[PDB]
């Protein structure tokens, strides 16, 4: 929207630590809007997808997805929700690839996410039906 | 966005009739987003404030305000909600002044709208406390 | 839809009584669908608008409008709902013209109907804002 | 109803990709009604039953069936609901034939769909009881 | 249905007292169906419409009408419900004719009863729209 | 009640197909009342017991039994409710014995139906306690 | 029942005060059951109807009537409920006779009590319809 | 209470069939109250504990116990409830004994019944804690 | 219970101010229990009944009475609840004596308090029925 | 509180039976207050902890604990609640020690009881964390 | 807590406009807390109590009081809640002293606020009982 | 806040027993707010983390975390909530390290705690994602 242009969070992330990158985003003023907070938090999830993190990104994405469901943002800003859902599905598929013990417990969450993605943009989500 | 982009709709209202302006907006091809429909509908409320109409604009604004409350749009896009609430309060205080018999039935709805406006931007709403 | 083409029930209303016209409508076919029932019942409300009746038509229309709200028919078949709402508003305005004692108790119902009509087709409803 | 007459969408699926077929539908326009959206979405489910897809069609059909249940469309437009339920059962059965591990978890959903189909048109749904 | 054929109960009301007529009905063979009880209670309401009583008949009819609403008897046995609603409306109109102070408090109950009668058999109820 | 006397429907099932027998009943109609619909649907379940069908009859009976529970029919017209539950238990006791794997799977429901039958006519149901 | 058979409570009331008669009752011994408590409390209401008290008896009776409604005692022990309701109606009619200011606020309570009495034993209650 | 004194019903069970005993107990002759019905139904459960029956008695007792819970009869008439609960527990312990497969599913129901018995009369229930 | 024995606080209200007496109470030693807080707060209400205060005592008593209702203290410690209810009734009667404008709005609260007092100890409350 | 001082009840348990001891307690005045009943019932649970009983004591304690939760007695009289919870935990730990098959099903109940004890008096409960 | 120390905001209100002062606060910079937002918003209510404003201050205070009720801030930070409630009561009393038309509608809100203040600090609130 | 400065309580746990340390805390004396109680209880959880205890600390922390959720303390005082959640996570990870049987049942609680920590301060929580 405006507060989503941070590829310098990505700089900080690589030069300094991952905590420093997030700490930067948290510090960024003069944050007021729940819109700007959610977007800032999406950056945090995006930056956590660059190096290791993953589990952190999954936690961050789950929170954004839950807030999006409440605020019914699939109607106003669908591209943002599609992104969150797709990122969440991608990472869950990797977590499900590492260990098959959780593949069974992650299966309902993944089916729901795919259903959600199909609901937002079927054409875009069609490719994601086959893993 | 792009819908709100349409000052030509306002011209149609003056050249042709008021129905023609709404019919054109209604006509125009075509919205799909549950969002952009709301923006198109805001233009309708705006165009209905340009000549007489008023009661039409009040009905239109009440609908937009009610959808905004459900979608909790005061958080995402507050300036739009502030506009809707303010326009609605202007036209209500008006209805309550045309005649004084309705001044009393409306009073709770007006106080709620003012509360809402103060909640969004108290600085901007401050001027609206004294009529 | 199919079982809507019945102007002969209107002749029955003129030649024979009003009870005969409705009684004819009630028996008439091998009616099944809730669609056909609702349409058949709309004919009853339409035929009750021809001679005196009015109060009967208002009762009939209130029922159809209530079923339409439940079935969320404003989305699927809006023209039919617009018709019901408009007919209901026309007749309530006439009942409100006869005696001003009920004008105050009918005022909320009439505003709601107009709000509903505006919601379905603003351009079409615009003309109905001024009584 | 009107925007259902699209067999050219099926051609696009064969000439271009499956995504191309769906995206062609996603931009009608000037799609407005929840009716025309649901019908357009049915075409998407129909087109997804032509080549591979299946899982996509099942997701699409589950959404349509869920919306039909809410809108209580089994009463108004039963043939459309029957189609959705029957298509859903057919594909569910095929998924149940491929792997018997999910046959046990799909069994409640399939019994419910059959019960629903019988409820709509028992004569038509009689043939589907024996697997 | 079977235990409805009691015109002798009407004789007892004229020969002995009204309490004696009801007291007899209350002591019929040990029939227990809620059907037989409701019918027996309808006879009580019918017998209370013969001499003075009225207020007793109104209380009796209100009870039957309330039980019919719960048991959704307007669907199974509509003629009986129509009878109860019509008798209830007739007597309320008479109570409304005696004193205009309660005419305003009885007005919602009477409109609801008429709406109910119209819902059961419009043709039959049509005549009851004009008082 | 009146439209229950249809043994010719049973002939159609043997001469023509099973679909034809059900299609006939639907056809006939000349149905309206939710009473006549229910009864007609009870004939469908009866005709589905004659040749194979069974699963179709179980689905049909369950629907009738569920409608009976809602309409609280074990009070007004209990004999019929007994018939539905009894036929339903009878067919399920058949499913049992055969594939006696679920049949343990079954037993709770089967329990309900016996409890249900006892509650209506304990004397009549007494014989059914021992299989 | 056999708790019921005190008058000696009635004796204490005339000999010693009214507080002394209740004080005796209150001290059981030994009450256990809610049946015995309710019965004991009915004696208290009965004893409060002997000399002045009245307002005390009304309070006592209102409590018993409310507990009877909850415990659905109109079914098991109707004579006791009839007694409570009748006593309550009698005393309310007396309070309504003293001052006409409360006659209007007591009117709903009295109509409900009469409706309740009619529901328990119509024959017995019939005489109470006319004041 | 009055219609409980029936040991001749027990004779009919031995001389004629079990159906005849229940059928004879169904020959009222003057049922009205829900009290008399519940007591009559207790006799049926008692008579079903005499020869085989058991499953019959269990169904009968479950119904009485469920009605007692609704009517909160543990407070008014606890001895009758204690009898029902104890008889129910006895016969469930027996079913559980016959097959150690339903001992696990009957365990919650049996613990609740014992808890209920302990709640009514601890001293009397104490002996039933050890099976 | 232990920290209830404080007539020394009554002194501080006469020697120093009323604020000093309450501030002294709020101070006290190391209280922990919600019991000790409620009792301390009762002392505050008692001390506010000595000089003017009244409105303060009413506010204090309403709070204690509301907490007693939640904690269902009428069962455990009824004497304390009786005291609170009686003190509250006494003061409301005085407030109702000063101005008859609030007598009508205080009437429901006073009847409920008396009903509550009667419920706790009828004998003790009997004297309070006549004002 | 007053009727808690009963060590003679413990003698009766040893001299006569366990039923005799409980039967003794069930008959002792002023058997009224829900306080006195709960305390009397605590003595019953205490006496059931002396010889065998155990399962009886567990049932008795569960009832007292449940009533304490409703009456929110952890606030007013925490020592008594602590006693009940601790006794309940002690006996459940013994039942778990006898057979480890139920140790897993008793584990949630025991964790909740310990949490409850810790909440009442952490210092006192600290010792109970290690079994 | 930290961002509460702002008397310069009060100067801006006198030098520039009331909107300039509020705006200045809304600026921050770069708070998140969500403590701050409530504290910052309290400063806005405080600054609105200096010149005219009042109605603005009332809306601001109502919002803070409502958030405090949700967050149950009367427990954590009572002095701040006391301030809000007291300020709210003061201003409502003045709005009452301007026109007696709203005195009656403001009366419940004022009694509740006083009750709330008494609940936080009785001693401090005691002085506010007399207007 | 004020009563948080207690490192002497930690000495008591080393010199005397753990019970003595907690026993000192309760006898502050004598905290009066819910804030001071929660802080005092945090000290108890902190002191239980020094020697063995652990299970005690987990119970203490679960209580504080649950109260923080109710009081929505993550907004006002996030550092304290972060501490509680982090301490709770640390100890659960240790309990999960000791035995892998509970690792699967503790997994949902640990994910929720981490999600909560990430929600409070993502940067701070980032380090805790990888175990």
UniProtKB/TrEMBL annotation, chains A, B, C, D, E, F, G, H, I, J, K, L:
Domain of life assignment: Bacteria
Protein name from the UniProt record: ImpA N-terminal domain-containing protein
Record organism: Escherichia coli (strain 55989 / EAEC)
């Amino acid at each position: 929207a405006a507060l989503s242009l941070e590829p310098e969070a990505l700089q900080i992330a690589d030069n300094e630590g991952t905590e420093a990158a997030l700490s930067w985003l948290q510090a960024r003023p003069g944050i007021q809007s729940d819109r700007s907070n959610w977007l800032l938090r999406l950056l945090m999830a995006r930056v956590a997808e660059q190096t290791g993190k993953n589990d952190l990104a999954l936690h961050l994405l789950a929170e954004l997805d839950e807030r999006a469901t409440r605020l019914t943002l699939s109607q106003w800003e669908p591209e943002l929700v599609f992104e969150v859902k797709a990122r969440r599905l991608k990472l869950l598929r990797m977590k499900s690839a590492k260990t098959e013990s959780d593949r069974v417990r992650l299966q309902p969450d993944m089916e729901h996410l795919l259903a959600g993605l199909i609901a937002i943009d079927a054409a875009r989500a069609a490719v994601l039906c086959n893993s």
